[PDB]
């Protein structure tokens, strides 16, 4: 088996060979077993929204041509897409809401393991929301912020403030004119589920406008999540760490935090440090916390916790034989981990009531008892380490250096070393003079249909050589970090001369041995909201709307409904947005044309669907350069 056809990560390839000889089924094996996949589903031409279904429509040929109730291909495709957007928005609803309740508990004295760690961020959020701070106690300010967060989930006398206060007024005006500003986060989710149910909305344009509005409810959840996590756990600043499977250590208790919410992982990290002696009593060197997926990104960004792996290759951490525990909250966890754990010895532990996996151990994690619950969880990990005494493990000796922690505040601060009172100006100067061609955000998942990381690295290499400033989040950041794109030592190899000059000038002004890394890691998937903050700040500084900026996004290997939601809000706020996997929309040309073309006339953004990464890079460059030309700039 040619493992490089499955993943371009050599550590993953090594574990795939191990899984094969041990007879352990992987995500790639389950994919092979699924081929050929259903063409109706692949194109979006299937509906199960009532008990008269399933209905399907032949992409081409003869009957069936229409759903039983009369639903056309346009309607069916648009309804399916809208439900995916709502599902993504719901995941970010759950995440943000979790943090809002935690902040509220903390400042009410009900969860002493949590506290206001970033007072400056708290006050800045309060001011943005219009909440008074002068003469007010921090705990009361925080209580008001938490109440405002929770209020954005339902209808009230104002729209969703985590949309209207985070985008420039001109953008809010454009969106309002089209009826696209959400009334409430969970309100929009419910309205999508209603309008897409049988015998309701049956006009493609109307349905898709609803989807754009629900995508902004998702944006609000993301931005709220980042805001609240920064208050509770600290705003990221530049950090140095490592990534890939080689960060596991045979002589340590290896504990992966996996899922999404720092409410959980942040405490695991702090408590693990207090349990060092207890781990040593058990014959370990200590507890080695490592990250998977977004919650890994959260603790990487804030604490420099090394990232083990991401997304599609998550099972491979277990295959090493050295993963003593995998601590889960929710989202993007392959439920296969629960059965693979039987083979590998790993203790898989769920912690949230709405996210259990048959065969896992469930240990409820209450914010009110976070430290004690964390100790219980970590003691299971220690017991597991003891059980593998004398057992061979195979940790690929493969890892990269990673510089990360580029929050928007961190980026502005780094730039301020070149211009203290106008920090964005040096960036803009270099866009204008051509040293920086534009900005591309890589975001989102890996997808088993695409050799792992192949689209991210192929596109990033082409853009970097063309002097594009590249930023990344989520498992896109994960892909790029595992392939060396966050190691400043690789700037000479990867970057165009203009971009190199800029990364070097900024790094040198920040007292570094040299440049910023080739790609700036802006955090987890909710932290795509940080990229919004940066872009909106640039828009405001320039006095133009986001759809005039040379900024694009690429979900190069997208998988989750959350990726569909984020991609859709990227388009809604005005960005050309690449998706590198086939979305289930191709069964309807009219829907495809709306999403890739006519939406430009509504929001200024648009999707670029392109499965070939070299071609995608060309299309992204063309989009950046069109923006440059629109600003009167050379390109």
Our CB check for ligand SF4 shows the closer of 33 and 420 to be: 33
CA distance 264 to 330: 11
Tokens 């790029």 locate to 480
Contact between 337 and a copy of itself by CB under 8 A: the answer reads: yes
Q: How far apart are alpha carbons 160 and 220 in whole angstroms?
A: 7
How far is it, in rounded angstroms, from Cα 500 to Cα 466? 11
The reply to whether 137 sits near ligand SF4 by the rule CB under 6 A is no
Question: Nearer to ligand FES by C-beta: 1 or 38?
Answer: 38
DSSP annotation of 68:
T
Give the x-and-dash track for 54-93 against ligand SF4 (CB under 6 A): -x-----------xxx-x----------------------
Q: Does 54 bind ligand FES (CB under 6 A)?
A: yes
The answer to whether 214 is a known ligand-binding residue is: no
- Least distance to a copy of itself, CB of residue 76, Å: 10
Stretch that binds ligand SF4, among 45-53, 138-146, 233-241, 606-614 (CB under 6 A): 45-53
Residue 525, marked binder: yes
Handedness of CA 613, 615, 618, 619 (dihedral sign): negative
> Tokens standing for 260?
């999404």
143 sits in which H/E element: helix 138-151
Structure tokens at 477: 């950041």
553 binds, among ligand SF4, Fe ion, a copy of itself, none (CB under 5 to 8 A by kind): none
Query: According to CB under 6 A, which one of 41, 130, 359, 434 is a site residue for ligand FES?
Result: 41
Question: Taking CB within 5 to 8 Å according to partner kind, which of Fe ion, ligand FES, a copy of itself, none is near residue 525?
Answer: Fe ion
Q: 80 vs 484, which CB is nearer to ligand FES?
A: 80
Q: Does position 64 bind ligand FES by CB under 6 A?
A: no
Phi, psi of 7 (to 5 degrees): -140, 140
353 binds a copy of itself (CB under 8 A): yes
Q: Are 555 and 579 in contact (CB under 8 A)?
A: yes
Q: How far apart are CA 465 and CA 248, in angstroms?
A: 33
In the block, which residue shows the tokens 């966050």?
Answer: 486
d(CA 404, CA 364): 32
**Measured between alpha carbons, how far is 394 from 319 in angstroms, rounded to an integer?**
8
Q: Is 257 in the site for Fe ion (CB under 5 A)?
A: no
3-state secondary structure of 502: helix
- Any binding-site annotation on 50? yes
Contact residue for ligand FES among 11, 46, 166, 341 (CB under 6 A): 46
Options 150, 151, 198, 343; binder of ligand SF4; rule CB under 6 A: 198
Which part of the chain contacts a copy of itself (CB under 8 A), choosing from 56-64, 159-167, 432-440, 612-620?
A: 56-64
Orientation of helix 204-233 relative to helix 528-542, angle to 10°: 100
Near Fe ion by CB under 5 A, which window of 22-30, 42-50, 124-132, 291-299?
291-299
The whole-angstrom separation of Cα 289 and Cα 248 is 9
- Dihedrals phi, psi of 261, to nearest 5 degrees: -95, 120
**CB under 5 to 8 A by kind: which of a copy of itself, Fe ion, ligand SF4, none does 262 bind?**
none
Query: What whole-number distance in Å separates Cα of residue 212 and Cα of residue 171?
Result: 14
CA 327, CA 266: separation in Å to the nearest integer?
12
Stretch that binds ligand FES, among 35-43, 196-204, 274-282, 358-366 (CB under 6 A): 35-43
Closest separation between CB of residue 178 and a copy of itself, Å? 12
Does residue 589 touch a copy of itself according to CB under 8 A? no
Instruction: Indicate which of ligand SF4, Fe ion, a copy of itself, none lies near residue 154 (CB less than 5 to 8 Å, by partner kind).
Output: a copy of itself
CB-nearer residue toward a copy of itself: 257 or 448: 448
Q: Tell me the three-class secondary structure of 303-354, residue by residue.
A: HCCCEEECHHHCHHHHHCCCEEEEEECCCCCCCCHHHHHHHHCCEEEECECC
Which of 40, 365, 569, 606 touches ligand FES (CB under 6 A)? 40
Window 546 to 585, contacts with a copy of itself (CB under 8 A): 558-564, 581-584
User: Taking CB under 8 A as the rule, does residue 354 contact a copy of itself?
Assistant: yes
Q: Using alpha carbons, list the distances in angstroms from residue 392 to 157, 253, 581.
A: 63, 15, 39
State in angstroms the smallest separation of the CB of 312 from a copy of itself.
Answer: 8
Q: Is 189 in the site for a copy of itself (CB under 8 A)?
A: yes
| Residue 277 found at the interface with a copy of itself (CB under 8 A) | no
How distant is the alpha carbon of residue 119 from its chain centre? 25
Please say which residue, 297 or 344, places its beta carbon nearer to Fe ion.
297
> Count residues contacting ligand SF4 (CB under 6 A)?
12
Q: 635 with 557: CB under 8 angstroms?
A: no
Residue from 578, 532, 533, 574 nearest 553 by CA: 578
390: left (phi over 0), alpha (psi -120 to 50) or beta: left
Which residues is 440 bridged to in the sheet? 470, 552
Tracing tokens 């009532």 back to the chain, one arrives at: 50
Name which of 323, 240, 293 is nearest 526 in CA terms: 293
Per CB under 6 A, the segment of 48-56, 242-250, 379-387, 545-553 that binds ligand FES is 48-56
By the rule CB under 6 A, 71 interacts with ligand FES: no
Return the DSSP state at 118: -
For position 38 contacting ligand FES by CB under 6 A, the verdict is yes
Q: Residue 308 annotated as binding? A: no
- Residue 584 beta carbon to ligand FES: minimum distance, rounded to whole angstroms: 9
Is 222 annotated in some ligand binding site?
no
Query: Annotated binding site for [Ni-4Fe-5S] cluster, which residues?
Result: 260, 294, 332, 445, 475, 525
Residues marked as binding for [4Fe-4S] cluster? 38, 46-47, 50, 55, 69
Which residues make up the interface to ligand FES (CB under 6 A)? Answer: 38, 40-41, 46, 48, 54, 56
Give the residue numbers of the binding site.
38, 46-47, 50, 55, 69, 260, 294, 332, 445, 475, 525
Residues that bind Fe ion (CB under 5 A): 294, 525
């Amino acid at each position: 088996a040619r493992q490089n056809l499955k993943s371009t990560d050599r550590a993953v390839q090594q574990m795939l060979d191990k899984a094969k000889r041990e007879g352990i089924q992987t995500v790639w094996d389950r994919y092979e077993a699924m081929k050929p996949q259903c063409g109706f589903g692949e194109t979006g031409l299937c509906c199960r929204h009532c008990l008269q279904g399933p209905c399907r429509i032949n992409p081409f040929g003869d009957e069936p041509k229409v759903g039983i109730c009369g639903a056309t291909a346009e309607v069916i495709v648009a309804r399916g897409l809208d439900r995916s957007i709502a599902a993504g928005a719901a995941g970010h609803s759950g995440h943000a809401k979790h943090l809002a309740h935690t902040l509220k508990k903390a400042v009410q004295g009900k969860a002493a393991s949590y506290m206001i760690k970033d007072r400056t961020k708290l006050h800045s959020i309060a001011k943005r929301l219009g909440i008074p701070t002068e003469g007010q106690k921090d705990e009361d300010i925080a209580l008001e912020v938490a109440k405002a967060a929770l209020a954005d989930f339902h209808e009230k006398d104002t729209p969703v403030l985590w949309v209207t206060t985070v985008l420039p007024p001109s953008r809010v005006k454009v969106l309002s004119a089209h009826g696209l500003i959400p009334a409430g986060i969970d309100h929009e989710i419910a309205e999508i589920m209603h309008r897409t149910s049988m015998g309701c909305d049956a006009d493609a344009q109307n349905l898709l406008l609803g989807g754009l509005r629900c995508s902004l409810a998702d944006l609000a959840g993301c931005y709220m999540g980042t805001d609240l996590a920064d208050i509770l756990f600290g705003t990221p600043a530049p950090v140095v760490t490592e990534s890939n499977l080689g960060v596991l250590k045979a002589d340590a208790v290896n504990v992966a935090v996996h899922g999404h919410n720092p409410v959980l992982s942040d405490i695991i990290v702090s408590v693990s440090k207090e349990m060092e002696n207890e781990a040593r009593a058990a014959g370990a060197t200590g507890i080695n916390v490592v990250g998977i997926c977004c919650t890994g990104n959260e603790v990487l960004m804030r604490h420099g916790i090394p990232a083990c792996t991401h997304s599609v290759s998550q099972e491979m951490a277990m295959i090493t034989g050295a993963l003593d525990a995998m601590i889960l909250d929710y989202q993007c966890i392959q439920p296969s981990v629960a059965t693979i754990a039987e083979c590998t010895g790993t203790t898989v532990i769920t912690t949230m009531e709405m996210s259990k996996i048959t065969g896992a151990t469930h240990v409820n994690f209450a914010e009110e008892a976070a430290v004690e619950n964390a100790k219980q969880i970590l003691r299971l990990a220690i017991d597991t380490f003891k059980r593998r005494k004398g057992k061979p493990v195979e940790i690929p000796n493969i890892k990269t250096k990673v510089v990360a922690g580029f929050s928007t505040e961190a980026i502005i601060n780094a730039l301020s070393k070149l211009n203290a009172n106008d920090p964005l100006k040096p960036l803009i100067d270099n866009v204008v003079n051509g040293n920086i061609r534009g900005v591309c955000l890589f975001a989102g998942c890996n997808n088993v249909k695409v050799p792992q990381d192949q689209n991210f690295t192929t596109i990033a290499r082409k853009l970097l050589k063309q002097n594009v400033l590249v930023v990344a989040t989520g498992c896109g950041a994960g892909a790029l970090m595992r392939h060396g794109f966050m190691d400043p030592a690789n700037v000479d190899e990867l970057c165009g001369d203009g971009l190199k000059a800029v990364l070097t000038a900024i790094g040198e002004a920040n007292g570094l041995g040299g440049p910023l890394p080739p790609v700036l890691h802006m955090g987890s998937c909710v932290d795509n909201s940080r990229a919004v903050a940066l872009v909106a700040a640039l828009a405001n500084r320039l006095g133009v709307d986001l759809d005039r900026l040379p900024v694009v996004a690429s979900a190069a290997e997208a998988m989750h409904e959350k990726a569909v939601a984020i991609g859709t809000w990227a388009v809604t706020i005005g960005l050309p947005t690449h998706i590198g996997v086939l979305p289930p929309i191709t069964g309807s040309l009219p829907v495809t044309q709306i999403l890739t073309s006519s939406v430009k006339d509504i929001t200024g953004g648009y999707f670029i669907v392109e499965l070939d990464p070299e071609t995608a890079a060309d299309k992204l460059l063309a989009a950046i350069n069109e923006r440059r030309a629109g600003l009167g700039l050379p390109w």
